[PDB]
Design a binder for this molecule. Structure first.
Ligand code: HEM
Ligand SMILES: Cc1cc2nc3c(=O)[nH]c(=O)nc-3n(C[C@H](O)[C@H](O)[C@H](O)COP(=O)(O)O)c2cc1C
Ligand code: FES
Length: 765
């Protein structure tokens, strides 16, 4: 028989050599788990492992599919200890009378979701903004102790400690009470996910029992100051609001559950990223140049080298997973580390590419119902760790010929030590001391696609009209800029905000972009900043050309009407048409000829074809005359203040439907007024959850309330950064970016202002 020849799975099927040689505790999976299962991604995506007791799942679609089906794959076993707790160690636990409830990571439905939704808000990026000064304080309090040595183990002296303290601060525990809770804070990787000796088991049960009853007093102490900062005081108020949802046992569990979910995973992530970066030192020095790429950098590290090598689910019914039959009761080892390295979803994957537009898809934080709530707390934490160490010690390198040891376990991965040298005298810090007052705002919660950007340099500022600059933006990389058609714009960070400005430069010049910003007399801050505090030699983050003002090139004729600074996109459209060799007519109005940019440019070219109508002299553009009656072929693109765009739309109402195209520089909306608006449900098919949107609530607000990744720049319906695909349902379109045909197809929606017409929509999210 075959049982005389090879091992057999619990389903009676034979087991492969490579599958039976799988060991998560030693050898190839401890050195590099992702590479150690390359053979499984290629030829056997799902197998039974004899060494450990689980079925192993290796490819990214599959382990994402396990995360979403939370009815079929239960997190019951999420922190089940690999080897069982001995009678001795249970007796030690019982002596402190410790009884922890399953707290969000183990909880099945229907208990898990109400507790997650109730306890979610402090984890959102908006709520985390309060804690950003605290982590910057703690990150530096540590680094300046070893700053002058030129030699440190980052792990023990910096990265093992800091995530523990901020977790205590995130939880809301008094600083008086913190130093002991840390004394009782220990590593759990080998005791939960490894093969510990009986002595190890008890030493954990002793430290965990000590911590359980001390945290019991701490909860009683803060029990009567509920209205203060922290997750636990936030938890107390929901108890009075929902006494059955949130129980005295639960927040006592929430005390330990909180900082064991937060300490080692973040420390290991920090250590991995620093080891991973100091291995490719060119990309290290890139981060040292500008810290603008830190946010996506830490995302590529989390994909490439996460703190979670694998995770676990309990199969609840007989299923098949990618052709392999899996029985009810089977335990799954879903290798997040292999998933992050699956060629079917990422491309050139074992490459460490921090500008990767794909990093955000890694499963290091999990996926779906139980996705890590503190992911943005950890994202912020890593980002600041990695800005201070790139700011102060860019001349830091790894001690060569260094061997990195990682504790034998199935799920957690982080070096025992990372040893780094640097030249102490050479710190940029001691000659500055200006770099420290520099603080870069955290950017968390946004997908990697929406945060990729080129940091260009300003090579020249030219005044071409009153209150109008012409900015010349140079790419410092040296590598050529994208091709862009007329009407295209860019999103440039004007200080703490981003604005978009059309491109009026030369397209055939592909070492530069040119924009002509106007000083808005009533300026919410973006236009002022450019005029008031930008000089030559600065560098601005600028996110590649998009275009909502594209021209159909097969039209008979183009007549362009332009008001004020609306001259910028049209003049590039005028240039395309002169190149084509096509009839066009351009009409340019403005308050004053002195304040009308590009008349010089408009005189040297298109001068035979331009007519000017400056207001100050008194010659005005009367659209009624111009568009008195149409012609079949003529199209009209136009851009300027809303008053002329509106009035023009009136004058061109006589014409065929697709005749007029406009680009708005301002937004109309809005008034929310739920009274006129109805709530609905939005379900996220990829994630496998339904988020409710209230009448007073935008779709965008509900997504960030579930801490789903989203980027929003304008939220006035004008910029386009919040677009997301619609699989089902018809949408109440309220943006100004999508063409009336794009709104018809219903394939897409703007997260911040558009809604449902109706009861539900399905989004690819
Ligand atoms: C980079 C460091 C971190 C990694 C790699 C990580 C990974 C995870 C993973 C894989 C899960 C389970 C996912 C699932 O079963 O869908 C998880 C659940 C969780 N994480 Fe983390 N996490 C980190 C930092 C944190 C921090 C700092 C907190 C804040 C205290 C945190 C709070 C949680 C909570 C509360 C859950 C359970 C939520 C639920 O099951 O609804 N995590 N985390
Ligand atoms: C030359 C120029 C081009 C602009 N192009 C666009 C654009 O293509 N899309 C857009 O939404 N806004 C555009 N704007 C408007 C700006 O984004 C912004 O609202 C304006 O300059 C004022 O910023 P502030 O009110 O924050 O000071 C443009 C403004 C200027 C001066
Ligand atoms: S955020 Fe710019 S359109 Fe929604």
């Amino acid at each position: 028989p075959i049982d005389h020849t090879a091992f057999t799975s619990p389903t009676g099927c034979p087991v492969s050599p490579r599958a039976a040689a799988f060991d998560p505790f030693t050898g190839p999976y401890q050195v590099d788990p992702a590479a150690s299962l390359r053979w499984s991604r290629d030829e056997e995506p799902v197998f039974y492992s004899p060494e450990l007791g689980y079925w192993v799942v290796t490819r990214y679609e599959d382990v994402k599919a396990v995360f979403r089906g939370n009815e079929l794959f239960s997190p019951s076993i999420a922190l089940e200890k690999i080897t069982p707790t001995s009678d001795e160690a249970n007796a030690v636990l019982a002596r402190y009378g410790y009884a922890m409830n399953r707290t969000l990571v183990n909880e099945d439905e229907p208990a898990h979701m109400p507790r997650r939704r109730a306890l979610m808000e402090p984890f959102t990026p908006a709520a985390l903004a309060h804690h950003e000064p605290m982590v910057r304080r703690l990150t530096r309090e540590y680094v300046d102790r070893f700053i002058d040595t030129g030699h440190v183990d980052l792990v023990d002296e910096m990265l093992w400690e800091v995530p523990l303290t901020v977790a205590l601060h995130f939880l809301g525990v008094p600083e008086e009470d913190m130093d002991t809770l840390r004394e009782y804070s220990i590593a759990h990787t080998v005791n939960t996910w490894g093969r510990p000796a009986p002595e190890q088991q008890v030493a954990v049960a002793d430290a965990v029992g000590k911590f359980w009853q001390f945290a019991g007093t701490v909860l009683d102490k803060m029990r009567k100051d509920p209205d203060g900062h922290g997750w636990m005081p936030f938890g107390i108020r929901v108890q009075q609001e929902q006494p059955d949802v949130v129980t005295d046992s639960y927040l006592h569990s929430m005390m330990m559950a909180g900082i064991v979910a937060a300490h080692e995973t973040t420390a290991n992530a920090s250590a991995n990223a620093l080891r991973l970066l100091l291995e490719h030192r060119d990309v290290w020095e890139e981060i040292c140049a500008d810290p603008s790429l830190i946010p996506n950098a830490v995302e590529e590290c989390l994909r490439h080298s996460g703190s979670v090598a694998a995770w676990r689910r309990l199969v609840t019914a007989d299923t098949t997973i990618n052709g392999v039959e899996v029985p009810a009761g089977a335990k799954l080892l879903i290798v997040n580390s292999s998933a992050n390295h699956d060629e079917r979803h990422f491309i050139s994957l074992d490459d460490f590419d921090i500008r990767r537009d794909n990093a955000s898809d890694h499963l290091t934080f999990g996926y779906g119902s139980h996705q890590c709530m503190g992911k943005n707390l950890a994202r912020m934490e890593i980002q600041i760790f990695l800005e201070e160490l790139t700011r102060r010690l860019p001349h830091m390198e790894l001690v060569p010929d260094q061997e990195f040891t990682y504790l034998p376990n199935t799920s957690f991965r982080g070096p025992d030590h990372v040893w780094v040298r640097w030249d102490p005298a050479r710190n940029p810090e001691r000659a500055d001391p200006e770099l420290l007052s520099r603080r870069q705002p955290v950017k968390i919660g946004e997908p990697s696609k929406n945060t990729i950007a080129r940091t260009m340099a300003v090579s020249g500022l030219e005044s071409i009209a009153d209150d109008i600059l012409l900015i010349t933006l140079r790419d410092t990389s040296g590598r050529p800029l994208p091709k862009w058609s007329a009407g295209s714009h860019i999103d440039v960070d004007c200080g703490a905000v981003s604005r978009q400005y059309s491109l009026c430069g030369d397209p055939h010049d592909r070492t530069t972009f040119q924009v002509a910003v106007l000083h808005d007399r009533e300026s919410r801050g973006g236009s002022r900043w450019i005029h008031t505090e930008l000089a030559v030699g600065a560098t601005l983050r600028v996110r590649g050309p998009r275009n909502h003002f594209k021209l159909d090139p097969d039209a008979k004729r183009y007549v362009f009407v332009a008001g004020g600074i609306g001259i910028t996109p049209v003049i590039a459209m005028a240039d395309q048409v002169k190149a084509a060799g096509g009839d066009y007519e351009i009409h340019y109005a403005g308050r004053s000829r002195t304040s009308m940019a590009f008349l010089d440019r408009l005189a040297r070219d298109h001068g035979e074809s331009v007519r000017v109508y400056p207001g100050d002299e008194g010659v005005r553009m009367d659209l009624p005359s111009l568009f008195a009656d149409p012609e079949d072929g003529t199209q009209v693109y136009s851009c300027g203040p809303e008053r002329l765009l509106s009035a023009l739309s009136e004058a061109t109402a006589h014409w065929p439907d697709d005749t007029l195209h406009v680009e708005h520089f301002s937004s109309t909306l809005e008034e929310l007024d739920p009274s006129k608006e109805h709530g609905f449900d939005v379900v996220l098919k990829d994630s496998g959850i339904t988020v409710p949107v209230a009448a007073d609530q935008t779709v965008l607000q509900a997504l960030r309330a579930a801490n789903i990744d989203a980027q929003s720049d304008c939220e006035e319906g004008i910029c386009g950064a919040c677009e997301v695909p619609v699989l089902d349902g018809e949408v109440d379109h309220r943006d100004l970016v999508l063409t009336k045909t794009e709104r018809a197809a219903g394939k897409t929606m703007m997260t911040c202002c558009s809604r449902a017409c109706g009861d539900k929509l399905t989004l690819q999210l």
